[PDB]
Design a protein around this ligand. Structure first.
Ligand SMILES: Cc1cc2nc3c(=O)[nH]c(=O)nc-3n(C[C@H](O)[C@H](O)[C@H](O)COP(=O)(O)OP(=O)(O)OC[C@H]3O[C@@H](n4cnc5c(N)ncnc54)[C@H](O)[C@@H]3O)c2cc1C
Ligand SMILES: Cc1cc2nc3c(=O)[nH]c(=O)nc-3n(C[C@H](O)[C@H](O)[C@H](O)COP(=O)(O)OP(=O)(O)OC[C@H]3O[C@@H](n4cnc5c(N)ncnc54)[C@H](O)[C@@H]3O)c2cc1C
Ligand SMILES: Cc1ncc(C[n+]2csc(CCOP(=O)(O)OP(=O)(O)O)c2C)c(N)n1
Ligand SMILES: Cc1ncc(C[n+]2csc(CCOP(=O)(O)OP(=O)(O)O)c2C)c(N)n1
Ligand SMILES: [K+]
Ligand SMILES: [K+]
Ligand SMILES: [Mg+2]
Ligand SMILES: [Mg+2]
Lengths: 542, 564
């Protein structure tokens, strides 16, 4: 019943700006073209928004993902019709796989032209249907606030993900002539006591456990307070904490209770603790088979405790669909994990010590460290050594440090051998494995966190996918530190450019390490450099 | 021979390899990954195929397009699951809009994993459904020859276009244990066929008309598009007909090269960015014989206002529009036509020829066309002492320098103002030599399309007339060019000091105010980093010598010209 006149007389472009403001957006990634011009002009022209221009729309999409991962905010993308929109399909699929909030706005031909094979009429809502949580084509300027608010709500709730909103040029150019319902303009906005019952039962089961383990994944990062309540629970009940690859950083790996990463490529200690726990407390993690291995062989002591009525598996999971999908759980706590951890906390018995359990874990840490063939006199440099050394150099700067990667062996070496300390600092394409992610993601993370040291630990073939964005980093004023672990040089051979001459052509400093004795000094020079810088290290082949 | 035992004992990967040979494929564009590995290893290790690697799968897709456009053969793409597949969506949408035959093979997670949200399981048949003529997920190795034969037949018939064949890793790794029907392993048939009395009579009747409707003559105009280029003999029979009945020829952007622009009866290009004489010779038409063209907006307008002098001869039942079109769906979809001739345009021309009454000359019209031209040339502000270089001037000089070599020349472009300047100011003579993204307008097309065209036509001089913003989209494929050895000639018309976005402009179009500037790399240092020669023109006095060196240079080379 309640009508709002406050947008009447505005174009859809100005209405778009105001809705961005209401959604607390101040950063947009994208690339102009005719169909999106009414919105692009409004956003370009307003000093309230930092518009970040890549050389390719794929770059905008991965920048938006890096921005979202680093800030906790949705990444907003603005591109034109036709090839502007089809060029952001890979980053939508990437955000869809990794549960990253992203709102994609695509210019479209006028509503009258739809279904006429017009120039750059793509069926973008058809194309993106399977790689978005939801998408829509806006049909009138009256509907623009509604759809925008709908889009942000969906992108950032449940398991976060990408949404796409298709914007016909006649709709965004139009002037709003009619009042619209006030609700549509305002950012939106028995099951309960089943959830409270499950919180109570989870607390009971945790209070009972002698050898619990917290198994933590990306979902803990989807609330600002997740890492803090995770740490509070781990201290309160003296529970060791292992993370998935996408949970790295959610728990300080220097904490005595850290087990580090679980899984096929994880810490043996993390895996042994999980195999021996009487209780697994799974928080925002999906039981991927790279983490569990053969699921029938997974957590036998927890399964035995369940069979005996004294432990098992608790799962804090926001999507009903993901509950009891892979493993049968004794207790599922449905909903946002941070929220539910906070409701549970007062019911947890404070435990002074678990001396035997931590003595066993620490014995394991001694018996089974990560191992790899280290350098010898005259040998080529090992990428694992670069990463270990760089982790220390970076940490010693005293700065907040964010790490992105490409896709390949270096991605796993980064996960394993970096020392993770802070949340929202490991930004890697895990669910889709998109080569080329590392550089634009670092540029977006740097925009999100302009004071942070932002390092891309990249591989040569990955880096080649999207290296045109080097000039974008210079233009955006993002002094990203690009590390190329170059293990190249029948089989497949790719010709690399000269990366140092490339970086200089693009407007940034370029450095190279060829032998062991140069590495320490060059790594220090690399992180100390004021602007953007590319360091190539020639490493051994696997 | 009912069953075919010849693949029994082979892996799907080896079957794929044999099926490429049966389809006469000798070039594949693609990029490795775990899911496509059984197929990748089978062809990347074969002396039968030239396997061309990009740095990004989008590059493979646009290379395959340039290859197809230059060769008349399907462009074959091979990429992995997940991001490999999503990375070729823009090239498929591009091929789909421009009717380019392309066969895309994507590796997929195993059939048992489909619908478990496995690592890199994308719904690629779903994603690619609106930008392919057809697609399919192969479900067993038995089915693999079948789907490959269907994909090539569909991609190359009717109006050509892209198809996608999704390849689960367990299917291509599997070994074929049982015989499969011979019908499913033998490639199909374009024509090479038989037709009924009924089919013959149907076509021959629409053909006898039009043939009569033309022999009537008057002020006719061949309006010719990409379709004339989709049969080896299209241009020849176009020329033959132009001569016979002495008819002037205008082309779309996508028909450029189908008619020699030197021939006295060439009207050159029409539409929004076409020349006055062509538009005049049409609109005020009479009888326009549309040959493999689709009356896009930028060509027509301006509907009702379109060809009225033809939309008269129709009322007066003395003219109108004849449409040689291969897809009945596109007939009367944009412009209501008086006679439709369904089918391949070239084949129908052939049939219609003899029935065509030779003509003396028509200089009541000719000398009138030859009047439009003088009174209305392509005009732009031409450089004066010390003034900036004009892009149109560069393109005209370059045309002449290329022509001076006596070589076959293929031109690709990026998208933007330079694309239209290339179309307008180059002098087009030979078929399949202008390769540009017209229907979708994909920035970044120029360089990988040139690389693929160069592979198709190794003896051709291949020039990419590119824009600076376009070129930045895909410039990583410079190293691909060096690796492939393709001696492409990359021209960057750098006008970076104008914005990419017009904010407003003076009424009499004299002045444009723009914003949104992109920071370019040093293109010459970049070319050298990527392993090729780089050249730069800053001033008028250098232009001639550099264009000559650019074109003369052995190997790939990048020339940047700073323009107004
Ligand atoms: C060859 C290979 C080897 C690998 N090796 C390893 C390895 O050794 N270790 C490892 O960890 N990974 C490894 N991976 C990565 C692994 O496959 C998964 O991508 C990763 O473990 C998934 O991490 P996740 O469960 O934290 O995140 P996600 O898949 O994002 O799942 C997070 C879960 O949290 C839920 N959720 C989201 N938000 C909330 C919320 N607010 N509240 C509650 N729940 C929420 C989601 O619905 C989801 O169920 C490997 C991958 C490959 C290809
Ligand atoms: C910035 C920009 C400006 C543009 N301005 C212009 C312009 O000014 N002038 C211009 O001409 N274009 C212009 N366009 C290009 C325009 O968008 C179209 O791409 C173009 O006009 C299409 O030409 P076409 O009809 O020949 O080709 P197509 O789009 O390929 O259509 C060909 C038609 O022929 C049919 N056909 C195909 N094969 C056969 C066959 N074997 N036998 C019979 N029929 C067949 C097809 O089914 C189809 O209907 C512009 C593009 C851009 C990006
Ligand atoms: C866009 C895309 N194409 C292909 C793949 C398959 N793939 C995964 S890793 C890899 C090689 C990675 O090379 P590099 O970046 O140099 O990392 P390295 O393994 O050497 O550390 C490929 C081709 C992919 N994940 N993404
Ligand atoms: C992939 C993609 N993004 C955006 C557009 C919209 N667009 C069309 S022309 C143009 C600018 C072209 O710049 P340039 O390549 O330098 O050509 P110029 O007009 O300067 O000659 C843009 C952004 C597009 N066609 N394709
Ligand atoms: K670590
Ligand atoms: K011309
Ligand atoms: Mg490598
Ligand atoms: Mg330009």
């Amino acid at each position: 019943p309640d009508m709002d006149t406050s947008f009447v007389g505005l174009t859809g472009g100005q209405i778009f700006n105001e809705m961005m403001s209401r959604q607390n957006v101040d950063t947009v990634f994208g690339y102009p073209g005719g169909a999106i011009l009414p919105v692009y002009d409004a956003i370009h022209n307003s000093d309230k928004f930092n518009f970040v221009l890549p050389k390719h729309e794929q770059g905008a999409g991965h920048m938006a993902e890096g921005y979202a991962r680093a800030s906790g905010k949705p990444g907003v993308v603005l591109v034109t019709s036709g090839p502007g929109a089809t060029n952001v399909v890979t980053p939508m699929a990437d955000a869809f796989a990794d549960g990253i909030p992203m709102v994609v706005f695509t210019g479209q031909v006028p509503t009258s032209a739809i279904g006429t094979d017009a120039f750059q009429e793509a069926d973008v809502v058809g194309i993106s249907r399977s790689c978005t949580k939801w998408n829509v084509m806006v049909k009138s300027v009256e509907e623009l606030p509604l759809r925008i608010n709908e889009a942000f709500e969906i992108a950032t709730s449940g398991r976060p993900g990408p949404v796409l909103v298709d914007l016909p040029k006649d709709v965004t150019a139009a002037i709003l002539r009619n009042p619209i319902p006030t609700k549509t303009t305002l950012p939106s906005n028995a099951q309960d006591e089943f959830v409270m019952q499950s919180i109570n039962k989870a607390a009971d089961l945790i209070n009972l456990a002698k050898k619990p383990v917290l198994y933590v994944g990306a979902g803990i990062l989807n609330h600002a307070d997740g890492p803090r309540l995770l740490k509070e629970l781990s201290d309160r009940a003296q529970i060791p904490v292992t993370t998935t690859l996408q949970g790295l950083g959610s728990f300080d790996q220097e904490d005595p209770k850290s087990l580090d990463m679980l899984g096929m490529h994880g810490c043996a200690t993390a895996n042994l603790a999980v195999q021996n726990a009487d209780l697994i407390i799974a928080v925002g993690a999906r039981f991927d088979d790279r983490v569990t291995g053969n699921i029938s062989k997974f957590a036998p002591e927890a399964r035995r405790a369940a069979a005996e009525g004294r432990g098992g598996i608790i799962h804090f999971e926001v999507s009903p669909k993901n509950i009891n999908k892979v493993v049968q759980t004794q207790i599922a706590v449905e909903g946002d994990a941070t929220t539910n951890l906070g409701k549970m906390m007062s019911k947890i018995f404070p435990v002074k010590e678990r001396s035997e359990w931590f003595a066993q874990i620490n014995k394991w840490k001694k018996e089974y460290p990560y191992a790899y063939m280290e350098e010898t006199p005259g040998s080529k440099i090992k990428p694992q050594t670069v990463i270990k050394k760089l982790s220390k150099v970076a940490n010693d700067t005293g700065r907040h440090v964010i790490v992105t990667t490409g896709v390949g062996q270096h991605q796993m070496w980064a996960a394993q051998h970096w020392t993770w300390r802070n949340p929202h600092t490991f930004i890697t394409s895990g669910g889709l494995g998109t080569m080329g992610y590392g550089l634009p993601a670092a540029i977006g993370a740097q925009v999100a966190k302009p004071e942070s040291l932002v390092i891309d630990i990249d591989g040569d073939a990955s880096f080649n996918m999207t290296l045109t964005e080097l000039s974008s980093a210079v233009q955006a004023g993002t002094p990203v530190k690009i590390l190329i672990l170059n293990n190249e040089e029948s089989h497949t051979h790719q010709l690399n450019p000269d990366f140092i001459k490339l970086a200089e052509a693009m407007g940034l400093k370029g450095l190279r390490v060829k032998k062991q004795e140069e590495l320490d000094a060059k790594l220090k020079e690399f992180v100390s450099t004021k602007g953007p810088v590319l360091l190539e290290v020639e490493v051994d082949k696997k």
